[PDB]
Amino acid sequence: VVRILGGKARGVALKVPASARPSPVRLRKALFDYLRLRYPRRGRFLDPFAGSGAVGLEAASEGWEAVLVEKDPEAVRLLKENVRRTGLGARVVALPVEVFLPEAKAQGERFTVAFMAPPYAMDLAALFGELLASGLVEAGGLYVLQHPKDLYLPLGERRVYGENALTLVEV
Secondary structure, eight states: OEEOOSGGGTTOEEOOOTTOOOOOHHHHHHHHHHHHHHOTTOOEEEEETOSSOHHHHHHHHTTOEEEEEOOOHHHHHHHHHHHHHHTOOOEEEOSOHHHHHHHHHHTTOOEEEEEEOOOTTSOTTHHHHHHHHHTOEEEEEEEEEEEETTSOOTTSEEEEETTEEEEEEEO
16 A cells, blocks of 8 residues: 555555554655655665565665565565565565674675664664664765654654654664
8 A cells, every 4th residue: 555656666565464653755755755855865774674675675666785684474475565566676675674784784784874763672773772782874974763763863853743752873
């Protein structure tokens, strides 16, 4: 019930398990209006906790070199089906974010943007802290954290969208 908003796969419906937020449309639409405005040259996009891939596939559709990591074999199954439906080229890494980050660093992996929208039931703060500490975003890039508007981080500027907020941390 969710579609890619722009780019090469604009309009394509994504299979999304009834167990998702899924992800506010004005939120996604706003994040990318900003991202293409701030990064016209694009770059590499990291999406840990990707689900069916709503945000990571949107980046891919918009010209980003997207890397999506997700642990749930179910979600991964849907993720791959979605990569197919959209016909987009994206790297799918099926493993826990807590394993990926360490390894990504050792491989000298780097990205321009790292978006994280983990399930609100987890400790969204310790998780953001870990992402921020990985140092995976190159100078000039961004760490974008989605969370309930009541959760507050002094790491950067925020934008509220109804009940969700996005915290953007510059590097």
